[PDB]
Design a protein around this motif. Structure first.
Motif, short mmCIF file in Angstrom:
data_model
loop_
_atom_site.label_atom_id
_atom_site.label_comp_id
_atom_site.label_asym_id
_atom_site.label_seq_id
_atom_site.Cartn_x
_atom_site.Cartn_y
_atom_site.Cartn_z
N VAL A 1 -2.80 -1.53 4.17
CA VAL A 1 -2.99 -0.19 4.70
C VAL A 1 -3.26 -0.27 6.21
O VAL A 1 -3.33 0.78 6.87
CB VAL A 1 -4.19 0.56 3.96
CG1 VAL A 1 -4.03 0.47 2.46
CG2 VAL A 1 -5.53 -0.07 4.27
N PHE B 1 -3.86 3.70 7.52
CA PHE B 1 -5.05 4.44 7.14
C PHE B 1 -6.08 4.28 8.23
O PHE B 1 -6.03 3.29 8.97
CB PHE B 1 -5.62 3.94 5.80
CG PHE B 1 -4.77 4.14 4.55
CD1 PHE B 1 -3.44 4.50 4.58
CD2 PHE B 1 -5.34 3.90 3.31
CE1 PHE B 1 -2.71 4.61 3.40
CE2 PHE B 1 -4.60 4.01 2.13
CZ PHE B 1 -3.27 4.37 2.17
N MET C 1 -4.86 8.96 5.42
CA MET C 1 -3.82 8.09 4.90
C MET C 1 -2.51 8.61 5.48
O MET C 1 -2.14 9.74 5.16
CB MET C 1 -3.81 8.18 3.36
CG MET C 1 -5.17 7.87 2.76
SD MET C 1 -5.16 7.93 0.96
CE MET C 1 -5.04 9.67 0.88
N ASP D 1 0.99 3.40 -2.95
CA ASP D 1 -0.36 3.82 -2.66
C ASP D 1 -0.88 4.71 -3.77
O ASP D 1 -2.02 5.18 -3.64
CB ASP D 1 -0.35 4.54 -1.35
CG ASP D 1 0.00 3.70 -0.13
OD1 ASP D 1 -0.50 2.59 0.06
OD2 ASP D 1 0.77 4.20 0.67
#
Lengths: 107, 120
Positions: free
Chosen positions: B64, B68, B83, B90
């Motif tokens: 991520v 994120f 996000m 995900d």
């Protein structure tokens, strides 16, 4: 990431039985090992932390031991409410990593 | 008592963005580091991102990193996870959780989970 290996991945037992769940880390975790229980659809809850300390309110049939790379969780007398998935997690090195889980199933 | 309550989430298409919230109460917010964990359906728990509210130190899992961002609003005692560029991998239940101390080094309080699904 320190790798954590939990075993058995599942077991079948009956009410009243004693069972031991194991977690091996890929290197010495210095007793920073914790156990969580999770029922279907719910968030994990802490049972034991720092290898042996029971969280308050957790039944005394639950106990934990281990040292170096090898750690265990024993339930002395399995109750109906204990059939669930258990995870160990190491807190020695970051990121925190979890075992893949042990499903305790009824026989 | 201490409570962690998440909201946000639902379903978006690949490429979409969502912002999860984890509102806390019952303790001094800056004194504990906070983390996001996820559980992809039928798999186990996986750590995603952490933040220390005292000095703003953040860390992210490699899956991520860059997409994120974890942040906090100290006046509202809330933890967030933005996000962006979501993808189907995900999909998961995302949990926030409090880390007790740096007999410590464990997660002592967990939020109830909120589901994020990425699909067309």
């Amino acid at each position: 990431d320190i790798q954590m290996t939990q075993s058995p991945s599942s077991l079948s037992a009956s009410v009243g039985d004693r069972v031991t769940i194991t977690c091996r880390a890929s290197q010495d975790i210095n007793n920073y090992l914790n156990w969580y229980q999770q029922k279907p659809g719910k968030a994990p809850k802490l049972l034991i932390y720092y290898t042996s300390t029971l969280e308050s309110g957790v039944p005394s049939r639950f106990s934990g031991s281990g040292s170096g790379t090898d750690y265990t969780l024993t339930i002395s007398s399995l109750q109906p409410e204990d059939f669930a998935t258990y995870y160990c997690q190491q807190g020695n090195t970051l990121p925190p990593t979890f075992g893949a889980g042990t499903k305790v199933e009824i026989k | 008592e201490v409570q962690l309550v998440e909201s946000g989430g639902g379903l978006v298409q690949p490429g979409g963005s969502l912002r999860l919230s984890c509102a806390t109460s019952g303790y001094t917010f800056t004194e504990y580091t906070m983390h996001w964990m996820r559980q992809a359906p039928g798999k186990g728990l996986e750590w995603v991102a952490g933040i220390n509210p005292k000095n703003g130190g953040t860390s992210y899992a490699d899956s991520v990193k860059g997409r994120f961002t974890i942040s906090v609003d100290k006046s509202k005692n809330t933890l967030y996870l933005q996000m962006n560029s979501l993808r189907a991998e995900d999909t998961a239940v995302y949990y926030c959780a409090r880390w007790r101390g740096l007999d410590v080094r464990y997660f002592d309080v967990w939020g109830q989970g909120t589901l994020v699904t990425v699909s067309s």
